[PDB]
Amino acid sequence: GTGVLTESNKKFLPFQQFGRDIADTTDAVRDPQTLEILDITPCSFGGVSV
Amino acid sequence: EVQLVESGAEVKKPGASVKVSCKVSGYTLTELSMHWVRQAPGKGLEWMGGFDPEDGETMYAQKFQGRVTMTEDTSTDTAYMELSSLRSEDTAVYYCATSTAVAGTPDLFDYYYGMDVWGQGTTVTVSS
Amino acid sequence: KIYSKHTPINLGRDLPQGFSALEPLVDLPIGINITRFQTLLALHRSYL
Numbered sequence: 233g234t235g236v237l238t239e240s241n242k243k244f245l246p247f248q249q250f251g252r253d254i255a256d257t258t259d260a261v262r263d264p265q266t267l268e269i270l271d272i273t274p275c276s277f278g279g280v281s282v
Numbered sequence: 283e284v285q286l287v288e289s290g291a292e293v294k295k296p297g298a299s300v301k302v303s304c305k306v307s308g309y310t311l312t313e314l315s316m317h318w319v320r321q322a323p324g325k326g327l328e329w330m331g332g333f334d335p336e337d338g339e340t341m342y343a344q345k346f347q348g349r350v351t352m353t354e355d356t357s358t359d360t361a362y363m364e365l366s367s368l369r370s371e372d373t374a375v376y377y378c379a380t381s382t383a384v385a386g387t388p389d390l391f392d393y394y395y396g397m398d399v400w401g402q403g404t405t406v407t408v409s410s
Numbered sequence: 411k412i413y414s415k416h417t418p419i420n421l422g423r424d425l426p427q428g429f430s431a432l433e434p435l436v437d438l439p440i441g442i443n444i445t446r447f448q449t450l451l452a453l454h455r456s457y458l
């Protein structure tokens with residue numbers, strides 16, 4: 233997936249690895265090597281009007 | 283509650299080892315301290331020796347040290363004791379006695395010493 | 411799959427009200443047929 237990876241304040245339980253939003257889209261991920269929670273946010277975008 | 287049964291009475295020429303058995307029931311040997319006692323006719327019954335729950339395992343009398351050796355079989359649940367070099371004064375009846383090793387719950391348990399339950403005796407006879 | 415939870419319940423009804431969600435503790439790759447079960451108890455010898 234494409235996005236930015238940020239520090240998250242969401243307290244994951246020890247069994248929980250993946251995270252979902254209200255949309256059930258991949259919102260956070262736990263890296264297997266070092267066990268911190270990386271919040272995934274899609275990269276900057278918008279509509280362009282001329 | 284333990285029940286103790288005995289071996290057969292025997293007579294033997296002096297100069298050989300004897301084999302006295304004690305078979306237990308209900309409670310295994312590892313839960314029980316085992317002791318052995320000689321009773322001569324016309325005399326009081328005297329302690330040959332037995333188990334020690336702490337500071338050692340199995341220890342013998344001072345007048346019988348180096349003569350009586352004592353084995354325990356958990357697989358057949360039998361306590362054997364043997365002694366060589368028979369004497370004419372050893373014409374006597376041999377008893378096996380047992381007691382619990384400890385007493386109480388596993389959280390709070392106390393050590394136990396004594397001879398509770400007496401089995402039937404085996405008459406050993408040394409003659410010509 | 412075994413899920414478990416330990417909850418301190420103030421003296422009263424053993425099955426309390428409210429919600430206590432059981433976290434997934436362990437999954438075991440067993441692959442056997444199971445139709446019956448039994449509970450294991452610990453028993454203490456008397457020595458008295």
Ligand SMILES: *[C@@H]1O[C@H](CO)[C@@H](O)[C@H](O)[C@H]1NC(C)=O
Nearest residue numbers: 249262263264265266267268
């Ligand atoms: C490698 O991954 C495991 C988790 O599977 C983790 O416990 C361990 O710390 C990782 N190794 C290092 C050097 O971080």
